[model samples]
Target: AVSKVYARSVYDSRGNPTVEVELTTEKGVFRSIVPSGASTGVHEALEMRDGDKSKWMGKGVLHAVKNVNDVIAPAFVKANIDVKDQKAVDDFLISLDGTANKSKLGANAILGVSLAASRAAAAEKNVPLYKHLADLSKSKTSPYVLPVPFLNVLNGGSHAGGALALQEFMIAPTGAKTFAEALRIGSEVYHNLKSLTKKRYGASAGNVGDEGGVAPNIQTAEEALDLIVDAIKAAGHDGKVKIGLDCASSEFFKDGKYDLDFKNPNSDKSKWLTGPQLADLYHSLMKRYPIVSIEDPFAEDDWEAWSHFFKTAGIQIVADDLTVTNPKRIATAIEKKAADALLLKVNQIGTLSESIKAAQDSFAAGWGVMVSHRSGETEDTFIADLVVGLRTGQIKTGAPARSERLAKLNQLLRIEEELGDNAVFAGENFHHGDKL
Candidate 1:
């Protein structure tokens, strides 16, 4: 049973106020901090903000903090719910909030408590958090799966106010046999990319975006992918490191046309591409580059575009803004055959139980799951444990640059070292769910 629950406002990687919760149990005190996104989905759970202009520029989270301490904590402690019962506790939290989107208590507040309870439960069971999470999830153990890290080496769109429309340009070290080796390959390639960017785009181009990816003053996706490919070859990992793109197409979708140059104040509508035209561009890029994954290639609600792209794309089609880690949306995407993978974000669903359920639902539908970090994150390593526990086989936590991004990767390194021979890295089988 949870003995005490407390919460306070804290800062995220983006320096915005977010909710942090601490829950005490007989075993110990457990804590969790929430992460926020830059290109958030429209259907995601509410991340409450104070909206006060004088404080944190209307981004304060004190209201959510008060909701946690004054509302969720008192009721939860009085109910005397066991922290180990994640489903029951999360269900209670949902009922208490009485909202479809968790706007009542805020997803940040509910998620903070939910994740804290998960940690406390892991302590109570006297097992590693990943093991406990596996028990709570599929109960599968041996040959614990470590994910292929998709390192976002370049950023644009909402993450960086630059000319490029693509939000993230990532490299996946799927050729590496172990997670540790994959991290090394990714880090070395990132360093090479940084050096190359500094040489070509000048030192000021080394300034990074929200997710610690360099934002060069480039205008096209081809330029970004070319730099990444050059970096991979320069690092002597050409075939080993494949590319991934997060188009975040919703940010550039205007009046039904996909604007490839949306950053310009007066972008020419005549130059905008139709859905098929955009898909053709992607096809061309895929044929040229070792592109393995494309996320949000179309607007979230553009089911026709998504289905058209997925029909013959022959790569990992990831749905982030479309699914938002909500089970119902996941079902919708599955029914429509929109995406082959679900980008799992905990805060998108507001509870650990719900996020796990989203992954389960995706796997049941024969889809891959890629555990993700938000653009605005904290030095929280919860998702590292989650990726291992769920065995999702792929994860994208930004480049191995910023401390917030490296924190999760470093935790995964520790997990790999601890698991020893029992650990298996998801190399070439990252998208092959059944193979995993």
Candidate 2:
């Protein structure tokens, strides 16, 4: 069979680029391979037969491009020798799953090529891709429930600093009978906090940065939780909504002596919290709200503290910067039992295959997966489908841009319509407004 390969580039709203590779064999099969947007570049080669074609692919930053070319390319080409049959493609993809064996040539690149190859091979044989994947190995899998009306508490007297404020939300799957109730409750909680901040500080109390400034009066976790619970009660969602926190560790403490410069270095370690402080914060928050999930409660790289949080928080502790969608880091976190879930972001690792592998590995090990967006965002609605396709529990895009977040929500709605009852809408919170 003869094969042909071509490339296309797409960008998010921020202008960051991601590449897609289209392969067609002389036979009638077609496959599209998408590189992670975070990759430095893409290197691909295609071999085509009558109706069958195989492609070798890899993605990484420029620094590793030469290494991939010299080492990964040759080995991949040699491996292609045994992959003449459809089953070979399946085996190739399966082999790329774990981090320990896959990171030598850049785990993200390996995963991209493997997934593309597997999809192409499956199409050639006219089998479902997921089915083919499932046939490869037995890994524990669980259903993911997307939480609706998730809140991200921003600005307040408590932990109001950019890095320390409470960014909590309530979530549960769209199909939950109480999903609407949860959204209403979450809104009430947010509004209550808004009112409380205004009452204590003034109309512009919680507002900080640009245009206005206020002294930061750290609010205790318990006080924050009280407002959340009250909001849930006010919205009549008292017992139905599940609360969660995303208090980024960076915000845990301000580097008091560190230069105010975002890039400045200093000995200002005073702003950073110790492990005990974080534990105390979590314990206090948990005491007030029935938290089901917590992400990045401690500093990144603080694996021991994360383990303690996981053991003590009595909630699903998740890691964002801690895992950063890198399989090796994820493996390390898993070995350490760092957290109970992972926050998956495409930009962090820079490839779809790599992100999926992280999700798959996390799923296999019984950890929750959350597909998230960066503070910088795009209109690309692919993530919505991704969340559905992979069955992740939550999404973190925040409230500022309804358009960006809505694109995914709209896509999810379409999927729900297309898939019938299996497609469910996660509840929306005040962050994005209640219009949807």
Candidate 3:
């Protein structure tokens, strides 16, 4: 039975207040913290927060905090802790909310409790979080592979304050033997990027963006890639570190066209491009850089151009906002071949069960899964365990900076160390097979 439940608002790495919840059941106490997003998708599950401008610039979650104690805690009182069926507990939470997007209780609130309960149950069973989650999601038979890190080293879109078109340009370490090595390669590149940015731009050039990536005053998307490529070479891992992008194109889409107004958000020095023109732009980038992964290159609803780009690009095309972790939409995307991969964000779906179900469905359909993190992150390393737990071959938890980002990767290293010989490093093989 759920004996006690509580919640408190805590600040994340970006100093933005987030949520941390504790769930106490018959087993013991279990806590879970959630991360926030700056560049949120239009179709993602809504995070409920009190909109009172008096507190934290209308970003306060006092209402969500109360929802846990008043509504959620009371409802789960004496409820049997169904450790085996996570779906049942999460389903009950959904039933309690009675909303499609979990707006009543907030996805953050529900996710916190849901995750905490699972953690408590895992404690009661005396198992690791990933082991518990794998059993819960029927991914136990899947091999436990540490996901290849897609470290975001440059930022734009809503994640930055200036001068670029894409949201993130990351370094994918494809030639590492282990998670630790991959992280080392990425760290080398990140450090080199820092040094290079400081030399070229200025002292504040290494200032981090929302995802802890360098927010330099680069002129265009190509400029960012050029720096990353240079950093890869400087780090002595030229061919080892490939490039990836999160176009976040929906943020730039307007009136059925894509605009480069982000290049000059202050002035009117903007350029517009048609869908085919944007496709050509990416092709040019691909030809120049060792770009392997591209997420949401077109608008979420723009499937025609996405299909065109997917076939011609011959790279790992991922769907973030395009699918929104929805099963039905994923099914539709398969028909159109919009993307070969899915960017799995837990809060994007509202619950852990749904997130796992979505990934399992994607895996069953022969698609790749890349678990991800938000821009506004917390110190919680749950996602680190999640990447190993789900055995997702790829992950993007920002650059090799920031305590929040480091927490996840460091936890993965600990998990991998604990696993020892059993650990499988999902390196180059986890990426596009035979293509790379």
Give the number of the best model, judged by TM-score: 1
Better of 1 and 3 by TM-score: 1
Question: Who wins the lDDT comparison?
Answer: 1
What is the lDDT of every predicted structure here? Answer: 0.89, 0.49, 0.82
Cα displacement (Å) at residue 62, model 3: 1.4
The TM-score of predicted model 1 comes to: 0.97
Q: Residues 88-141, candidate 2, lDDT per residue (tens digit)? A: 543453354333333344433443344445455556556544333333322212
Clashes of each: 0, 24, 0
Model 1: per-residue Cα lDDT over 231-333, one tens digit each: 9989999799899899999899988899988888989999998899999999999999999999999998899999988999999999998887877788889
Off by over 4 Å in 1: 37-42, 159-162, 433-435
lDDT sort, best first: 1, 3, 2
lDDT of 3 by residue, 164-225 (tens): 87988888898898888998999999999999999998998878776777887777877788
Worst 10 residues of 3 by lDDT: 427-436
Q: What is the C-alpha RMSD of each candidate to the true structure, in Å?
A: 1.6, 9.9, 2.6
